[PDB]
Symmetry: C3
Subunit: 276 residues, 3 copies
């Protein structure tokens, strides 16, 4: 499939909750909060009204990367955009399509791989909040953008993936030939380098090449640092066939200390070449 034009206006509830293990999360539902928070997909031109209810005991906020929002939706202590504890506040994210300005210049669309995260917990930059798991993927499609069969989010949050314990995964699961979207986010103090076995992508907006004239580098290794966001797609097993395809931070310490996961690509039999 390809994505349609936007303009639709969505109403979402987002709850800021303490998880059973004392972590923090966004969720569409009271008690259902996940780390990472839920995926939010918009099409260019869409508008999202998110009413945030903060159940914590500390002021918490909602900040987004790359979408259009006014100073009142900033999510910051600075701009008085945060949510006092047991409070609720509606955030408004806006999105626009590429086009020409009055002078003739080209205006860049909102489309890309983005993320939302808390800006007020533990410090005025959300250091406490980010550490404890308040973050999530935001994806903005452009009219005509190829769409996946699945999206998977991997956040390198300091030394952990998705605030999972070391050597935890996650593993993701696909069958040969599915189109698989990967959204990569990074947080904390450290730089990483993201690697995937048996697959490669294009370093550009969509991780997909236009046609024969796209100069973009093809790479299976991309260095990243806190709050970077990118994504790409893959045809699973393309040319490499089924199996367990490792993905990991390539900083050698981080890898040995367990920032690793598995991309389990299955034969159409739903069978996988025998692994460890």
């Amino acid at each position: 499939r390809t994505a349609p034009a936007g303009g639709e206006v969505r109403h979402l509830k987002l709850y800021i909750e303490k998880l059973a293990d004392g972590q923090l999360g966004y969720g569409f539902e009271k008690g259902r909060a996940t780390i990472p928070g839920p995926l939010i997909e918009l099409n260019e031109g869409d508008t999202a009204h998110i009413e945030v209810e903060n159940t914590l005991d500390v002021p918490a906020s909602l900040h987004v990367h790359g979408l259009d929002y006014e100073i009142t939706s900033d999510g910051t202590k600075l701009n008085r955009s945060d949510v006092e504890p047991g409070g609720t506040r509606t955030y408004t994210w806006r999105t626009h399509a590429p086009g020409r300005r009055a002078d003739g210049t080209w205006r860049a669309g909102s489309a890309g791989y983005w993320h939302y995260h808390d800006h007020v917990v533990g410090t005025e930059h959300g250091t406490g909040g980010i550490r404890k798991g308040l973050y999530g993927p935001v994806v903005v499609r452009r009219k005509g953008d190829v769409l996946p069969d699945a999206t998977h989010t991997i956040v390198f949050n300091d030394m952990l993936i998705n605030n999972q314990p070391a050597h935890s995964g996650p593993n993701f699961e696909a069958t040969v030939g599915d189109r698989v979207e990967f959204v990569m986010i990074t947080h904390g103090e450290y730089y990483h380098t993201f690697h995937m076995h048996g697959h490669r992508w294009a370093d550009n907006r969509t991780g997909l090449l236009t046609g024969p004239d796209d100069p973009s580098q093809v790479i299976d290794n991309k260095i990243v640092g806190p709050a970077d966001s990118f994504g790409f797609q893959v045809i699973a097993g393309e040319g490499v066939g089924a199996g367990a395809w490792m993905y990991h931070c390539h900083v050698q310490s981080h890898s040995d200390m367990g920032m690793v996961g598995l991309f389990l690509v299955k034969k159409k039999d739903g069978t996988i070449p025998g692994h460890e």
Copy 2:
């Protein structure tokens, strides 16, 4: 407006001098130096002759990124390009437009977001000199490149912004609809992530999509290490509006430790919604 064709020759005089302690600037007039140094603005094809007088009591130099210079302008003790204390030397920067070679291959233009820094003070790679603030923005335009209303230079130097103490800014002030050009330069030991609230830019030469077919990633956040140089223009408050829009390093401790500042975008009447 837009950048015209280059080829004009320029003469400029740079002084290397101490200001406060732990700080050494470049400046166009004696006593007038700053951190960062003056912006040098060229069009592709222009030549820069820069007269440099070293008022420091140790050797200092001029070394530039991306522009053409011969070995004699290198800026290094290696190539004996340094400036003796109290002395003077004239550097040369050439610049060229893109074009076909004889073999028919494409030779790239000089244009881009570049910078100069001292290569000999405190070490042979200018460790001492860079730390104390000898660095500056160099911007070379391609004919047809858009010109900004204002240009602002944001340098991340180790843990400080433009060698300003934590939480001291700098702030940057514009008005909605202004085309504000930023040039971002990193120096020192550490990588960073430069981020800005409410705005975005292309990841490419000019930081501006050439049109609908530009594949470049649109981004509000970029990893950068020492000597990295990039630039872009935004329409101030475009799609977002008046407000005091943070920029900062996104490394968690970095932003908490005071690498923070404001792009302060006013209304047409001077209004910033209260903060």
Copy 3:
């Protein structure tokens, strides 16, 4: 001169062996294996069968970036691709050209600057093998790609360039007007920024602008991290003349610690400006 279309089948023999002190390397020749390991060049579509012979007494393997390889050629302990001590094993790399997919999307080719390295020695991720010098360049070319006169590989491995001691270089040699290719691979714990004096390139697959309409920023400085891989081509001293043009890591304490070397560009004379 330009690369042709691929599709050949290749057979290459690689020896993992222990070098003079505690050091490990890949080699074509039994006994003279080098750090970094031998350059492997391919045209898009080339199929390469590589026999590996492991002369060490711990397991060891071969793992490549970007090329098509099946799970049995992974080079890992979990996918059961590691080579027992004394044993030999054949790894298959495969390559393909770009073209319209079944769904009419454009499938990316394999062309680019890649590397191989060890995924087994000392850890599941080969930290010890990589540290000890098991790593080396791969270059996959597209039909039409411009060929160089010479190819140099610079590897940043932790704090050492190509496993040489600090301040030992390597230095590379060229005549003005040479078309010189540099492959740059990074490994270890650290990030660097690769700087080159008097020479600039384009950030993209080949390092060279495909024409006037390639938006890619032009750079002399690029931040990199473990397993990152790129490469480019310059014309020796184009616009800047002969001389000794430093290259180095521009992380300031890394410069000082000796990640530094020379691009020595001679006149057709054979003469070089002094340094």
